[PDB]
Structures are given as C-alpha cells and as structure tokens.
Write a protein that binds this DNA or RNA. Structure first.
Ligand SMILES: [Mg+2]
Ligand SMILES: [Mg+2]
Ligand SMILES: [Mg+2]
Ligand SMILES: [Mg+2]
Ligand SMILES: [Mg+2]
Lengths: 100, 88, 55, 51, 117
RNA sequence: CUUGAGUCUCGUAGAGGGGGGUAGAAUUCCAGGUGUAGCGGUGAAAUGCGUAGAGAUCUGGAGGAAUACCGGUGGCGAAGGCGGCCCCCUGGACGAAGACUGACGCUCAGGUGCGAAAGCGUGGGGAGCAAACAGGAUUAGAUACCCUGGUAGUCCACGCCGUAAACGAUGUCGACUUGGAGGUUGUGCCCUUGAGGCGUGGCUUCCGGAGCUAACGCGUUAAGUCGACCGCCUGGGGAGUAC
C-alpha cells in the first residue's frame, strides 16, 4: 500500500455529516489493512474564492496508506455525494504525519 | 520498471547462484518480464508510441543478448529458451 | 516553503493579483521555485489561496 | 486591482494597477497571438539582455 | 429621484471610445454618458479629454439621485481610463474604492489577426 | 581479463508518452432586472448592430477551446514535438557507492516504425479565430492589405497522407587539444556554525586561443587533431519536370 494525502472539504450546513463521513472512510481503509498516519480537520474555514457560492466550507485531512484499489472506490464516492464539494488527493511522498 | 520483489525474485531463479543480476541468463528473463507485461499496457492505449520506444529497444536487446549466449555457450542458450517459452 | 497548507509562507510569493512572484524578485533557486510555485496552484484549487484579487 | 484610501485627499495610487496587470498582459493580447514569435522573437530578448 | 446617496462608477475605456455608467451598488444602471455621444467624433472622441467632458455629463444625472459618494470600476486601456476618475473625484463626488475590473484571460480565447499595415 | 557495453541497489529532476478526471480567468450565446440614444469600427469612414430599446451595468444559466502569473540563457524527448491541478498505466536520462555478466560493441544499403501544419475518410463537437464567399472603404484599377460578417477548418475518436527554411541549413559512435564567464540538475567534503566555501559527474548558454576557413566564422557541445561505418555532391536554366 502507498500513502495518499487526501483533503476533502464538505458543505457548510452539512457539518453533522463530517464525523459520519470520516468514521466511515477510516473503517473501509483500515478494513483493507490500510494505515492512517494522520487526520486533521480545518473545520468550518473561510474560503478564498466563492467555490460555487457559500464562501465557507469544512475541510479534513487523511494522508492514509491504503491500496490504490480502495482509495479508488472512494475517489468516486466523493463525486456521488452532494454533501461534499471539491476533493483532492496526492500520492505517497513518504508517510506524512502530524503538523499542518 | 519492474517490481522490486519480482525483480530480485526472478534473479535468484536464473542467476548462476545468488546476487548476480549481471548474469547473462538473468538479463533475458528479467527483461522478458517487462516485455511480456507491457503487452497489456500497450494492448490498451496503443498510441503510446513514445513508450513503445522503450519496449522495442529492450526487445531488440533481448535478441542481441540471446545471440551472444548461443555464441559463447550453446548449452545455456537452448535451455533458457525453454523455461521462458521463447523462440516462436 | 513547499506545501499548500502553509498558506502563510505562500503569501510571501504572491502579489495582490494573486499571481506568484518571479524567481528573480525573490532571488530564490529555480529548483525551489518550481516545487514552490506548484504549491500555490494546488492551494488555489482548495480555496486556500486567491486566483486573483477579484475572484 | 483593488484600492481604497482613508481621508479624502484624492490619490489614485495607480501603481498597484500597472505594477502587474493593465497593459502588457493586455496590449500583448490586444491583437492576434504569436504562435511562432514567442519561441523566437520573444527568446531574442536575451540577445539584448546578455548585454 | 429616489436618493441613493451612493453607488458605483463604471468606465469602459476602449481604444476608440469611452463611456461612464453610474449605478447603485446593486448594479442597476442609474445614469450613463458616452464620449462619442458628446459631440466630437472619431479621432477627437478617442482622446483623454473626451472622457472627462463626457464623464462630467454623466454626473449631470446620477447626482440628482441623492448620490453623495461612489466607487470606481475601470476596465480596458485607452485614454480617459484615468481621466474619467479625476472628473468625478473632482466633481465633488466623494471617492472611495478604485478597482480595475479590466478582464485578463489565463489563456483561453484566440485574439483576431487583423492589424497588418 | 575488465577499462567498452549491459544487469542490480539506491536515490535525482523533468511542458517525455497513453488514459481518465478536474479548477479558475475570459469569450460568445440565452433569460431576465436596471438604464437611454447611441454602440461598433477607421487614417478617416462606411457596411453593420441600436427606440422591436443596443451598448454599458447586474443576476442566473449553456457551451467550446485554451491554460495569465510561475517561465528562464529553463526542463524533457530520437525526431516531430511536449506547459494549470489531480490520479492511473508507462519510457528514457543522470549521480552515487559499490555487487554482477564478461567484448555481449560501433555503424548499417534494403526493411520497420515514429512523422508540424495543411489536406482526405467516417462519425461526433463548434466559443473564438478564420481560406472560401459576402458586403463596406481604399485606388487609376485593388479579384489585396483595412473594416463588417462568415463556411471549411481548427477541437475529438479511429484510419489515410508522409511533406516543411522537418534547420545547428552542421549523420552516428569513440579518443585527444590552452582558457574565462554563467544557467541546470546529481554527489563528496568545510567552526556546514551560512544560502556561505571547496571540490567533483550529466546537461546547457556566452566570450574566445591554437588550429581550421575563401571569408563570414567554428572553437574541449568544433567546422581543431584522428579513427569505424553510412548518406549525399560533380555547372546554371530546362527540372525535382516528363516517361
Ligand atoms: Mg477578415
Ligand atoms: Mg491535422
Ligand atoms: Mg476532417
Ligand atoms: Mg537535452
Ligand atoms: Mg566563439
């Protein structure tokens, strides 16, 4: 398995889902023998540009270590979940931890 | 290029002993790998010409490698072919 | 100096128009400028930085 | 570019404007692109910059 | 006729003509005035002065709208781009925030050939 | 046999390639709010668009193409060529210490494959630009330059076409031959106390000595001094034409 620094921001008035989403993700990841080396939460932070209105979103970090197979099953879930908006995900670059 | 595991692994299998990658027979097999595998990557996309270069290059190298073996030891040559199901 | 999260450091290599500052005006290494400049981009795509002074 | 001054003294401070945008990025695009002129004409600036 | 006490000033300083449109912060055209539509034509209407003499004429409308102060929205090159301001800024109109809305494409559309003599 | 070539380990940077996503800036178009007599264009104009309400301005939406800034004497590639960001599949180049195979090399007619743009086929897509074409102006004329529109095409998928001032107008591989200045990336060392300094590899600009050159100029990235192999030249027109 490789590392993947994923940071997905969710709709503001959807914060209640933030915990549910996170808990669900981590589950699948760990299930496939994945390793979580970090997990931030920038919370309801101000947005630079009005990304599709609502200049306020809810960010979160991951930087896990799951097989490309699973993250893929996830890369799509984000697209099929109105609740979440812009989603990014970088590669390994050596398991990042804490800080940020 | 090649999987570290599968790489070293495939080496011990043909190496004149152990930790002798430079070994002739070894090169062939080790090369045939990415060769027989790229087939898939190339079967798809197909227009990945630039990548073809690497293939064609390493491909010709196998020949230039086998010919040598057959020239400095007809034995090993005729053997390797078998275990790799080469020569048509 | 090389991370979109570090929205602080980046604000140093970004004028008012949001555009990044040339490697000369900063006198920084080109090698660093590249990995650095790219951070501003990826950061701009997470609303962590302004594309321009307007939107 | 954005510009707001405190106390009415009437000073444009048009610096922040031309200090980047305005012409150039405009006058350059005002007419058809270059396509070829950049990889050459534009790269002939050093022929003057070198000295 | 409604007294807005304040709005915004738009200036479309084109290379051949300049126009000023004062409107409430909402973006509803309150009063407009163009250089060309102020007598002088061609070469003369595309001069810096033209914008001034024309711009001042715009206030001759959006002023009786209770307007006291306004912002500045400048876009495009050409003369008047700067002149237009002074006119208002000096026409008693209390200034505030000058902004250059001049468009700048991050490389998208291909400009027309033209100009070749 | 090991110095040539190659294999391995470990890192190094990258607009190298195929595929799929994706963001923001602008353009045009549609709808509506505000507002009124112009706008647009030029050297002037005029065609054109405007009271059936344009332009400007604000709000929402539709879509296509291209990625400002970073960006450069920059980087990658056999060549053509390749710039937003993200992932997936993938090739090559480089240094480091070494470990290994053991001359397995260089070149190559024919052959094979890759080939800018324009063009051709089928089926998609089409904002902007734009051969054709259409007006308008210029002029002695103006089948042009300039203006107002605008079709092919440009974009896409698979196939075809193989040309370019396909240019460094400079075939490839190897070895020697004073220097100076700078960019790029790797690596060893130095109160590292520093980005600081020293070295030492690959790549790359600029100046230039010897020598070479008809001169211009080239100059350790040679067009210098040699070697292996290949391609081509033998006056200009007719002619890269006919058959
Ligand atoms: Mg035309
Ligand atoms: Mg084509
Ligand atoms: Mg076609
Ligand atoms: Mg190179
Ligand atoms: Mg020289």
């Amino acid at each position: 398995m490789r590392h993947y620094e994923i940071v997905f921001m969710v709709h503001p008035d959807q914060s209640e889902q933030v915990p549910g989403m996170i808990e669900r993700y981590t589950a699948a990841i760990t299930g496939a023998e994945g390793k979580i080396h970090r997990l931030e939460d920038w919370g309801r932070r101000q947005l630079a540009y009005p990304i599709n209105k609502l200049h306020k979103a809810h960010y979160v970090l991951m930087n896990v270590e799951a097989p490309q197979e699973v993250i893929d099953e996830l890369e799509t879930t984000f697209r099929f979940n109105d609740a979440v908006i812009r989603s990014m995900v970088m590669r390994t670059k050596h398991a990042v931890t804490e800080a940020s | 290029s090649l999987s570290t595991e599968a790489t070293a692994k495939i080496v011990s299998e043909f190496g004149r002993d152990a930790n002798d990658t430079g070994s002739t027979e070894v090169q062939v097999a080790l090369l045939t790998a990415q060769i027989n595998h790229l087939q898939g990557h190339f079967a798809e996309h197909k227009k990945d010409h630039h990548s073809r270069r690497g293939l064609l290059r390493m491909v010709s190298q196998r020949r230039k490698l086998l010919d040598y073996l057959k020239r400095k030891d007809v034995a090993r040559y005729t053997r390797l072919i078998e275990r790799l199901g080469l020569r048509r | 100096e090389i991370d979109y999260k570090d929205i602080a450091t980046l604000k140093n290599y970004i004028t008012e128009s949001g555009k990044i500052v040339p490697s000369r005006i900063t006198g920084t290494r080109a090698k660093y400028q590249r990995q650095l400049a790219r951070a501003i981009k990826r950061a701009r795509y997470l609303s962590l930085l302004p594309y321009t002074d307007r939107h | 570019i954005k510009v707001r001054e405190n106390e009415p003294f009437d000073v444009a401070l048009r610096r922040f404007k031309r200090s980047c945008e305005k012409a150039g990025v405009l006058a350059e695009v005002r007419r058809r692109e270059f396509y070829e002129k950049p990889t050459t004409e534009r790269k002939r600036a050093k022929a003057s910059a070198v000295k | 006729r409604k007294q807005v006490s304040d709005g915004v000033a738009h200036i479309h300083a084109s290379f051949n003509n300049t126009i000023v449109t004062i409107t409430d912060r909402q973006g509803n055209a309150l009063g407009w005035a163009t250089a060309g539509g102020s007598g002088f034509r061609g070469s003369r209407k595309s001069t810096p002065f033209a914008a001034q003499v024309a711009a001042e004429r715009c206030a001759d409308a959006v002023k009786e709208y209770g307007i006291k102060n306004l912002e500045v929205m400048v876009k495009g090159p050409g003369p008047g781009r700067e002149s237009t301001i002074r006119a208002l800024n000096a026409a008693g109109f209390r200034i505030t925030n000058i902004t250059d809305v001049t468009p700048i494409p991050h490389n998208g559309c291909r400009p027309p050939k033209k100009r070749r003599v």
